[PDB]
Amino acid sequence: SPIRRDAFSIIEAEEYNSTNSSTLQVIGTPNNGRGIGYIENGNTVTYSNIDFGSGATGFSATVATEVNTSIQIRSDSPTGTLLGTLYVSSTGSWNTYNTVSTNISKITGVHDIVLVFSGPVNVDNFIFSRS
Ligand SMILES: O[C@@H]1[C@@H](O)[C@H](O[C@@H]2CO[C@@H](O)[C@H](O)[C@H]2O)OC[C@H]1O
Ligand SMILES: [Ca+2]
Numbered sequence: 001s002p003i004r005r006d007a008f009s010i011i012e013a014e015e016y017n018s019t020n021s022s023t024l025q026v027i028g029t030p031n032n033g034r035g036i037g038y039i040e041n042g043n044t045v046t047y048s049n050i051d052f053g054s055g056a057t058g059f060s061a062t063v064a065t066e067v068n069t070s071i072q073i074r075s076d077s078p079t080g081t082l083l084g085t086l087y088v089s090s091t092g093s094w095n096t097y098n099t100v101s102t103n104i105s106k107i108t109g110v111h112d113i114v115l116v117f118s119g120p121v122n123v124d125n126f127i128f129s130r131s
């Protein structure tokens, strides 16, 4: 998985750098893309050295789930700053992907990003939006 990445270009969820999970798998999507799934509550997934440049204040992810769930976006580590929380309600199937967005606190410069999962969701990709 890449050692660094730009916040303002698509980041593939399957190209993560570390996770605490023992269940998480790289999955296929309907259009022969990939994602992450078999995620459980408490699972964290880290993406190294994301460059936010002069500032991001939003987060968008393309996700699929059949249960209402939430994903914290943290900077630096699992106990680092809570940037925001993406609340995801059921998209209707594990294979029906929806872009969902939330606000975050303005973050600048280079930081690891940790996604923290409250439950099962399939994640294809994500991207940040500038301030
Ligand atoms: O059709 C398959 C999906 O069902 C699968 O998504 C998984 C469904 O079971 C859930 O408990 C898991 O959390 C979730 O990832 O992904 C692969 C796809 O081919
Ligand atoms: Ca993907």
Ligand code: NA
Pocket: 020, 021, 022
């Ligand atoms: Na393990």
